[PDB]
Design a protein around this motif. Sequence first.
Motif, short mmCIF file in Angstrom:
data_model
loop_
_atom_site.label_atom_id
_atom_site.label_comp_id
_atom_site.label_asym_id
_atom_site.label_seq_id
_atom_site.Cartn_x
_atom_site.Cartn_y
_atom_site.Cartn_z
N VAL A 141 -18.08 -22.43 25.76
CA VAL A 141 -16.89 -21.58 25.69
C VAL A 141 -17.24 -20.14 26.06
N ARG A 142 -18.36 -19.63 25.55
CA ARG A 142 -18.78 -18.28 25.89
C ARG A 142 -19.08 -18.19 27.39
N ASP A 143 -18.56 -17.13 28.01
CA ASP A 143 -18.59 -17.05 29.47
C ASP A 143 -20.00 -16.86 30.00
N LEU A 144 -20.82 -16.06 29.31
CA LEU A 144 -22.18 -15.81 29.77
C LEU A 144 -23.14 -16.63 28.92
N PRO A 145 -23.71 -17.71 29.45
CA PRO A 145 -24.56 -18.58 28.62
C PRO A 145 -26.03 -18.18 28.64
N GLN A 146 -26.85 -18.91 27.88
CA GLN A 146 -28.27 -18.60 27.79
C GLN A 146 -29.04 -19.02 29.04
N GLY A 147 -28.46 -19.88 29.87
CA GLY A 147 -29.12 -20.32 31.09
C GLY A 147 -29.42 -19.19 32.05
N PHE A 148 -30.66 -19.12 32.53
CA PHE A 148 -31.09 -18.07 33.44
C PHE A 148 -31.21 -18.64 34.85
N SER A 149 -30.63 -17.94 35.82
CA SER A 149 -30.66 -18.35 37.21
C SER A 149 -30.75 -17.12 38.10
N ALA A 150 -31.50 -17.24 39.19
CA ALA A 150 -31.68 -16.12 40.11
C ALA A 150 -30.39 -15.85 40.88
N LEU A 151 -30.37 -14.71 41.56
CA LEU A 151 -29.22 -14.29 42.36
C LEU A 151 -29.65 -14.14 43.81
N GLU A 152 -28.93 -14.81 44.72
CA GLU A 152 -29.34 -14.79 46.11
C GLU A 152 -28.51 -13.80 46.91
N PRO A 153 -29.12 -13.12 47.88
CA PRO A 153 -28.36 -12.19 48.72
C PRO A 153 -27.30 -12.92 49.53
N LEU A 154 -26.17 -12.24 49.74
CA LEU A 154 -25.07 -12.79 50.52
C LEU A 154 -24.82 -12.00 51.80
N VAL A 155 -24.56 -10.70 51.70
CA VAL A 155 -24.24 -9.87 52.85
C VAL A 155 -24.75 -8.46 52.57
N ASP A 156 -25.38 -7.85 53.57
CA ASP A 156 -25.75 -6.44 53.53
C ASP A 156 -24.88 -5.67 54.51
N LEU A 157 -24.53 -4.44 54.13
CA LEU A 157 -23.61 -3.62 54.92
C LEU A 157 -24.26 -2.27 55.21
#
Lengths: 48, 48
Positions: free
Chosen positions: B19-35
Amino acid sequence: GFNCYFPLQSYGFQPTNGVGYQPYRVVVLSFELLHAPATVCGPKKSTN
Amino acid sequence: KNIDGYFKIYSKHTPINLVRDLPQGFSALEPLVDLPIGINITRFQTLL
């Protein structure tokens, strides 16, 4: 009418018209340099 | 982010079940677009 002229004037283009009267196409390309990284660059050579 | 006059955006899609929107699971963040836009940025507002 009198003391009132149209802001725009046409042109006379014909194949038999003179060289000065011959139609010409003109293109102007302008370059600017602001405080931004370049986004338009020429081709860069690549070797095998 | 905004570094050296570049607007960098990252993203990552991850499923959730709790239910809580931000969970304990950790995951990396990948680049999408640079401007490469040089603009002074100090305020932002979201849209709906």
